[PDB]
Every structure is written in structure tokens, then in C-alpha cells.
């Protein structure tokens, strides 16, 4: 083995130095450094991950295109399709109920 | 539990001889693979014989 | 096999704290750590999340309840008793 | 070190030039009883603290 | 280089640009790679038949300064 002098002057084992071991072209075994893990949004009330969109960090979302961070339908990157399907037929029924109750 | 998925998916064992035979695999009573091969040369000929 | 005879769940605590102080904590470790049967879903998956907060995994209701049981018997009279006390008040 | 202020590298600049021998000529001025530099600090012998 | 191209005129397209200072070519025993230094990127066209090389070699903006390794 060689063993690794790190590159930055922060020597502790924090989350802000995650790191990996990579062979260079010189065959010399350095550290590259690992960024925190990008993630996919959560649902409104399912609180589970949304289908459709690539994982991101908040700094990398300004350099994206719109379809990478939402889906297509109404309440796209906000609601899961099942909750919206609930939110439609709840909202349709109660406006429907508020007619026949009011007559 | 891999031999068994080889023995459903070829055809050599019914489904009803899985949730009998999974649960005797999960549960100690099969020492080798070779004994389980010989409750399919044994518990299989009877169902053909009774048929 | 019957791994124990008496102690059951509190064998983890074993030979410490006193016999009749570990007879009592078994009451509340069998009742906590338990799947109850969900009253909205019907499928028995309702474990406790924290002290007093019970949550069911499939179809995600969270219901506030007792500290180790899911529904205390002091509450379970009152949940009925206010239902009797309401029907004599509207009418 | 390696992580110092601007004010601390400026004061440690100054204490690096006050750390000098006496010039060889001022021993020869008329009525110059400067024998040695008297207030020469030394890195392991006196620290700074000050 | 982070880019290669596939279509051949596209490689000729970027050669006639207001950036794109110089073009490098590299013979291999298998193929011959063409590389064009652009501003933000650098584009590789690789050809492997040894006869379309000098075909696409001129085919050239003449004021584009070549780099030549043989």
C-alpha cells in the first residue's frame, strides 16, 4: 500500500470530508473528495420519494432544466399521483355534495 | 431456496409443494441439498401414484 | 423450544432488579412491542412510535394512545361516556 | 500556526526584524556604549506571550 | 476532452467558428483522431479508415492552424 495524506487541512472525520481512494494516471493513490448525497423530493402527505425527477442538492438545482425537477401533471413535483388522485375525487365529491345539500 | 426455484420454474414441483417445502426448509429439516433432492424423488412419486 | 419457564420477555433484564420488580415490567413489555390490529386499516401492524404515540405502517395513520397499551381502559369508558353524554344534549 | 490573523502575522513580522545583532559600526561611534543587542529574543529560550 | 462528435459535417461545422483556435490530429496504428480546441469545450472526431483522414483533412478552413503530430 501507499497510505494517504489528505489534501485539505481539515483532519477530522466529519461529513464535510467524505472521501474515496482513486488511482491516478501516475499510479499514485490519492483522495478525491465526495460531496453530500443528492436526493429526490418527498410527497405532500405520503412523505415518500417522488417518482420522476433526478436527485439534487440545493446548490445544483439552479443549473437544471425544468423537467428534471418536476413531472408533468398538476401538483407535479409536490404531490404523489395517488394523493392528487385522492385530492381530485375528494374535491369533486364535496363540491358535488354541497349542491344537493343546499337544495 | 434456490434449488426450489429451480424446481418450480422448470415445472418439476407444484406451487402447493412450496409452501409446504419452503417452510420445511425454513425449519431445520433438510441437512444437505441431497436430502431435498430425495424428497422430490420420494414425495413426488406418490402424488403421481395417487393420481 | 420453550426457551424460558417464567421470565419470558424480561430475561434480557436477567438476574437483576428483583423478582417482583421484574414480574411487573413484563406486563408492559408484552403490551408494548406488540402489533395491535389497526382500526382504520384492519391489518395488525400498529406498533408504538414513542410513549403514547402509536402508528400503523400500512396506510399511515398515527393515533395517540396509551403509554404501553394502545387504548387505556380509562379512556375507553370516556370515549363511550361522552357518546352517551352527547346524545342527551343534542336531544 | 498556518491559520493566523492578519494582526498576528503583522506583529510577528515586527518581532522578526527587531531580533538583530547590533550593526558593526555603531560600536565605533564616539560615546556609544552599546555592547551587544540587549533585547534579542530567541525562539525556544524566551517565548513571546506579549 | 469531454466531447466527441459522430457526424462528419458537425466536425467540419465547428472548424469554421469564431472561437476554435487550433486543430490537433493524432495518428494511431488503428485509427486517426482529430481534435479541435474550442473555447469552452474541445471536440474529437475519430476516423479509422486511413483514407477519409486526408479527405476530411482538407475539407478545412485554411486559416485554422493545425497541430500536427505524425
Amino acid at each position: 500500500v501507499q497510505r494517504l495524506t489528505l489534501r485539505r487541512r481539515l483532519s477530522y472525520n466529519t461529513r464535510s470530508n467524505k472521501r474515496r481512494i482513486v488511482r491516478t494516471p501516475g499510479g499514485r493513490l490519492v483522495y478525491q473528495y465526495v460531496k453530500k448525497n443528492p436526493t429526490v423530493p418527498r410527497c405532500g402527505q405520503c412523505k415518500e420519494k417522488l417518482k420522476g425527477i433526478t436527485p439534487s442538492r440545493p446548490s445544483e438545482r439552479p443549473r437544471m432544466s425544468k423537467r428534471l425537477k418536476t413531472v408533468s401533471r398538476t401538483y407535479g413535483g409536490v404531490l404523489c399521483h395517488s394523493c392528487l388522485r385522492e385530492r381530485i375525487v375528494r374535491a369533486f365529491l364535496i363540491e358535488e355534495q354541497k349542491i344537493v345539500k343546499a337544495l | 431456496r434456490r434449488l426450489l426455484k429451480k424446481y418450480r420454474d422448470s415445472k418439476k414441483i407444484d406451487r402447493h409443494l412450496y409452501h409446504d417445502l419452503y417452510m420445511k426448509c425454513k425449519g431445520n429439516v433438510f441437512k444437505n441439498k441431497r436430502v431435498l433432492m430425495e424428497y422430490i424423488h420420494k414425495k413426488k412419486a406418490e402424488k403421481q401414484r395417487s393420481k | 423450544a420453550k426457551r424460558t419457564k417464567k421470565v419470558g420477555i424480561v430475561g434480557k433484564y436477567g438476574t437483576r432488579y428483583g423478582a417482583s420488580l421484574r414480574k411487573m415490567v413484563k406486563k408492559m413489555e408484552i403490551t408494548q412491542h406488540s402489533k395491535y390490529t389497526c382500526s382504520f386499516c384492519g391489518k395488525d401492524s400498529m406498533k408504538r412510535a414513542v410513549v403514547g404515540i402509536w402508528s400503523c405502517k400500512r396506510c399511515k395513520r398515527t393515533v395517540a394512545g396509551g403509554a404501553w397499551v394502545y387504548s387505556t381502559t380509562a379512556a375507553a369508558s370516556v370515549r363511550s361516556a361522552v357518546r352517551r353524554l352527547r346524545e342527551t344534549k343534542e336531544q | 500556526a498556518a491559520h493566523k490573523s492578519f494582526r498576528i502575522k503583522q506583529k510577528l513580522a515586527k518581532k522578526l526584524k527587531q531580533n538583530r545583532s547590533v550593526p558593526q559600526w555603531v560600536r565605533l561611534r564616539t560615546g556609544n556604549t552599546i555592547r551587544y543587542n540587549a533585547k534579542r529574543r530567541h525562539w525556544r529560550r524566551t517565548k513571546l506571550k506579549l | 476532452m469531454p466531447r466527441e462528435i459522430k457526424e462528419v459535417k458537425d466536425f467540419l461545422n465547428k472548424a469554421r467558428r469564431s472561437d476554435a483556435r487550433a486543430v490537433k490530429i493524432k495518428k494511431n496504428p488503428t485509427n486517426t483522431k482529430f481534435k479541435i480546441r474550442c473555447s469552452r469545450f474541445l471536440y474529437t472526431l475519430v476516423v479509422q479508415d486511413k483514407e477519409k483522414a486526408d479527405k476530411i483533412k482538407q475539407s478545412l478552413p485554411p486559416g485554422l492552424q493545425v497541430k500536427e503530430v505524425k
Binding site: - | - | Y13, L21, G66, S71, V78, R79, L85 | - | -
Partner: protein, 152 residues
Amino acid sequence: PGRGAPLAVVHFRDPYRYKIRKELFIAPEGMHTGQFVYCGRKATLQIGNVMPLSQMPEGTIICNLEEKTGDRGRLARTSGNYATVIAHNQDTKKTRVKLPSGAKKVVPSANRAMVGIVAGGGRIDKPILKAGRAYHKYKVKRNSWPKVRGVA
């Protein structure tokens, strides 16, 4: 973290602004998510709606009761505890409740209270059993330490 009884994140509409106004309540027992709570005077008696003491009839049990009429909820707030409405009076509107010490107070009859016994009880019935469960019990409350006996 530090409490004994769960809290409920109810949110209502603001009536004069366009905001959804999120509210922490002391959760009465048997309050799932997605329940409608009906906080007001013309509400009906079911747990845990809040409604003033005047409307709800004698014999009911309440929690998160108001002490002075409008002060948001002081009396009987810990897990398992409750206060029965024991009597009324139409003369000067003063309602006797019975508090968890047994001391029977005379609160006035317009202060709000949430009907039902507060969830998360009764938790004092199981031994802490260890001293590293009292260390954990108090490291999120305060430094009523290991208390040494002062005779020593």
C-alpha cells in the same frame, strides 16, 4: 422531548388573513391524524373538540383547561390526567370542576377546555429500573441530578 404526553399538530385556516395557522395541542386520547377538531362555542361534545365550559354538560371530563377565561389552556395537561365538570351555576356563571389533585376549583363558565383524557398515560406505572434510564429521563428535562441526600 421532555414531555410525558403527545402533542398534536392541528392546523386551521386563518379567518382574516390567507394563512394556514399551525397549532400544537395537548393530544387527548384517541386522536388519529386526519381527524377534524372543532374548536369553538357552537361545537359539539366529542373528543377532543374545545368549547367553553358553559356548553358542555356536567359529568364530562376535560383537559388542557383554561384557568382565566381566554388564557389558552393551563390546568390538567399531563398524560393520563383530566378534570371532570362536576356542576354548573346559572347565577354569575361559575362552574365547579375537579382537578387532578382532587381539589375542586370554581372556574368561571366561559373558559375553553378540550374534552377527553389526555393521551400518553399512564406512564408512571412501569419501573425505570436502572439508573441509566433516569439519566435519560432527566437529561432532557433539567439537572435534578442524582440527588444526594443532604444528611450526608
